[PDB]
Structure formats: structure tokens, C-alpha cells
């Protein structure tokens, strides 16, 4: 005989370890149908911030247009949701991005040869040859002069290698962001495993 | 395709949530059906699958080049010793239960790391459809051509199939 | 797979004692996304109750 009072008297949680990335906690006497659903929602249904529309004003280097457009969307942005809100695709382009639904990013890098002597370290040999994730700069749109002032939009691991360049080459882009379910695409996924 | 001759279409892009997790929470990538093997007998895929385990921690050129190896000195029993010198699951059946369910399963699930390829002659430009379309000027028949996208041919020996069903208001 | 312990020991699973591991994406703390999951299901439970049956 099951009643929800009786669930309460024999349900336990053993939080064995709880870190800032990888939490590990035990459960007791809950059915598998509920416990899978908690696994089910944490991959799909918890929403997250991700880059969605990428506007390249100039892409000159060897990494192509569509490949580097794909990598920027993969970049996990260290911004809590319930700050943005959803987009609504029943309304056109100039109404679809507001001050409230879209973190707006941009990235501008040119490479030029640094005079150095050699067999040569290719950081010392060219200026800005690596395009790390910590070159993505937040641009404050709208009312975002104090509502992201404490937390500027920082990529959660700022050492992602977005591109490599050579002198002459440049990448000049503008990438919007959005809040969305992980059930659509695998860049909104709020969990590693 | 793997490197043993197992072709196969990407039949359905399956969501990662209703897909079985593993020992750790590993979810696989390419589910291949174990009914495919007994007509093929490609055991080289099975020994590649557990030496991908045994290459993913160790760093020597894993001698999958054959024939320095006997029946007594089987390379799945010469470097079957590597399974027992780091404590592997020696029968290769790695832990991997279903998810959509929430249980462990009957089998333990054979799971591994098999080097897959991707084939050239792809099929994303094949289908065509025609409601009423163009004609031909000689016969007022639908015009032949994949690139004009007209004229599925009902040949000589499909007319001699629709008679075979006894039907004729299909052949009409 | 041994002879000596072929029958002296058996293996089983405690069929209700789960061990969740929840790693993070770097945006959120892992205990908090578990709080988001247990209320999304509650957000999904109320919303069917707050939905009337027409045909």
C-alpha cells in the first residue's frame, strides 16, 4: 500500500560529495521511473545560454565560415538563466532580438608578423595567432550596463581554442546568444554527464 | 563503415536521452545490431572493439598487423594478457544498461571503440516527386529526366505485374 | 570467472538505491541544476492539471 506520506518516511538522500562541478549524491527507496526522469530532464529540459546566430562580417583565415560558426555555439557561457528570457519565433528579424533575450557577443582579431629571431615558438613568432575563448568580448546592448556589470559574460572555460591564424588573416564577427532547451540541439546541454 | 566491411545507413538520428548509459554515464555513438555479424563472421570487429579499450590507456603501436601470432600465441590471447595485467573486464562485455527503462539488463552489453569511416556516394539528392509536371512534345507523356524531375517509368515488366494481380483499373 | 568462487558468492543490485553523478557545464553549480530538474517536472505536473479536457 503506497501513500505519499509513506514515501516521506523512507526516502533518504546521502550527499556523499558535492563539488563546484561534479556532484555525487545517493538516493534511497525511490522508484526507477522517477529517478530516470531526473536524469532525463537534466540533459534535455533544463535550459541554458548558448550562441545561436553568428554574423561574420569578415572571415579570412583557413578555418571556414560554417565550421567556426559551429564552434562558437558550443562555448559554455558562465551566465545563469532567469536573467534572459526565451525567444519567440512568431515575429520577424528586427523584433526577435531585444535587450532582454539576447546577450550580444563580438570577436575581432587580426594577425601580423612580430619581428623576432629564430625553430620558433609560434606564439612569439606571430601576434594573436591563437584565438582563445577569452577574446570573445561581451558587448552591452540596451539596459545591460548594470544588469551584467557584476557578471560580464565570460566563457566558462576561457581556454577553448577557437581558431589559429597567420599574418594577413582576420576573423571579424558578431554572434548573438539565446536561451534554449537542450532537447533541440546539443549545445544547450547544462550537464557534462 | 568500420574497417571490416560493415556498411550501413544512418537509419535514424536517435536522441541521446533515450539511449543507454554505461559504467560511468557514457553513452555510445553508433549502435550496430549484433544480428549483422553471424552472416559476416567479422570477429576482427570484436577484437578491435576491446583493444580500443586496451589502447585508450596504453601508448605503444598496437600491433593489429597480423601473423606474428599463433593459435597458442593468439593476439587476442597474447595481448589478452594485457586484459589481466591492468584488471580489465576480461570477457570484454563492458557495463552498459538501457536508459529509457531504468534497469540493468539481461546481457552486460559489449561496448567498444571501433574506427569508423564515412562514405562518399551519399543519398541526399535522390528523391523526386511530380504532381502534374511538364510533358513531351511528341507524345504528351511526362518528360524523362532526373534534373527536370519528371517521368517515373513504369516499364515493360511492371505492366506485366499489374495484370498479375488481376487488377486493371490500376493499369488503366 | 573463477572456479573457487564459482558459487560461493553472488552479485546483485539494490534496485532502489541510486547513485547520481551530476557534472557541470561551467555555467551552474551541479546541485542547483538538480533543483531545476525536480521543479521542471513539477512545472510539468501542474501544467497538465491546469489544462481542461476539450474533446
Amino acid at each position: 500500500e503506497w501513500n505519499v506520506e509513506k514515501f516521506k518516511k523512507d526516502f533518504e538522500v546521502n550527499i556523499s560529495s558535492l563539488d563546484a562541478r561534479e556532484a555525487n549524491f545517493d538516493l534511497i527507496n525511490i522508484d526507477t521511473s522517477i529517478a530516470n526522469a531526473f536524469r532525463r530532464i537534466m540533459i534535455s529540459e533544463v535550459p541554458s545560454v548558448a550562441a545561436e546566430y553568428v554574423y561574420f562580417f569578415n572571415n579570412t583565415s583557413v578555418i571556414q565560415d560554417e565550421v567556426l560558426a559551429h564552434r562558437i555555439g558550443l562555448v559554455p557561457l558562465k551566465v545563469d538563466p532567469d536573467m534572459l528570457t526565451w525567444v519567440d519565433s512568431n515575429l520577424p528579424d528586427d523584433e526577435k532580438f531585444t535587450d532582454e533575450n539576447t546577450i550580444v557577443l563580438s570577436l575581432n582579431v587580426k594577425c601580423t608578423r612580430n619581428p623576432d629571431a629564430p625553430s620558433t615558438d609560434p606564439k612569439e613568432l606571430y601576434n594573436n595567432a591563437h584565438v582563445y575563448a577569452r577574446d570573445l568580448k561581451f558587448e552591452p546592448q540596451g539596459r545591460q550596463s548594470t544588469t551584467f556589470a557584476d557578471c560580464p559574460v565570460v566563457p566558462a572555460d576561457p581556454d577553448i581554442l577557437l581558431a589559429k591564424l597567420r599574418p594577413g588573416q582576420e576573423i571579424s564577427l558578431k554572434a548573438h546568444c539565446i536561451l534554449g532547451i537542450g532537447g533541440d540541439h546539443a549545445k544547450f546541454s547544462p550537464v557534462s554527464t | 563503415s568500420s574497417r571490416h566491411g560493415q556498411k550501413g545507413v544512418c537509419s535514424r538520428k536517435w536522441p541521446t536521452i533515450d539511449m543507454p548509459f554505461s559504467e560511468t554515464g557514457i553513452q555510445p555513438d553508433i549502435i550496430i545490431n549484433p544480428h549483422a555479424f553471424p552472416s559476416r563472421m567479422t570477429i576482427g570487429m570484436f577484437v578491435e572493439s576491446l583493444a580500443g579499450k586496451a589502447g585508450a590507456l596504453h601508448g605503444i603501436a598496437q600491433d593489429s598487423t597480423p601473423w606474428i601470432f599463433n593459435e597458442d600465441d593468439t593476439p587476442a590471447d597474447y595481448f589478452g594478457e594485457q586484459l589481466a595485467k591492468a584488471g580489465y573486464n576480461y570477457h570484454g562485455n563492458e557495463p552498459m544498461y538501457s536508459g529509457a527503462t531504468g534497469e540493468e539488463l539481461r546481457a552486460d552489453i559489449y561496448v567498444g571503440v571501433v574506427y569508423y569511416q564515412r562514405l562518399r556516394h551519399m543519398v541526399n539528392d535522390k528523391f523526386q516527386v511530380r504532381s502534374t509536371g511538364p510533358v513531351n512534345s511528341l507524345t504528351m507523356q511526362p518528360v524523362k529526366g532526373r534534373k527536370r524531375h519528371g517521368g517515373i517509368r513504369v516499364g515493360e515488366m511492371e505492366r506485366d505485374a499489374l495484370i498479375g494481380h488481376g487488377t486493371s483499373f490500376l493499369l488503366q | 570467472r573463477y572456479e573457487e568462487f564459482a558459487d560461493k558468492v553472488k552479485l546483485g543490485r539494490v534496485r532502489n538505491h541510486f547513485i547520481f553523478n551530476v557534472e557541470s557545464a561551467g555555467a551552474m553549480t551541479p546541485e542547483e541544476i538538480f533543483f531545476k530538474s525536480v521543479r521542471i517536472l513539477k512545472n510539468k505536473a501542474e501544467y497538465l492539471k491546469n489544462c481542461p479536457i476539450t474533446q
Partner: peptide
Amino acid sequence: RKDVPKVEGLKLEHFATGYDAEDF
């Protein structure tokens, strides 16, 4: 019929979950 030179110096790495360095 001697065998091939054994990998001088293997070590063990197939180990468990939730534990970091508990092999001694």
C-alpha cells in the same frame, strides 16, 4: 619458438569510480 619481448614495465589503470588515487 620463443615469444616476442614482453612490454618491460606495464602498469595497472582499469579502476573504479568516485575515487581518485586509492591504489597502494
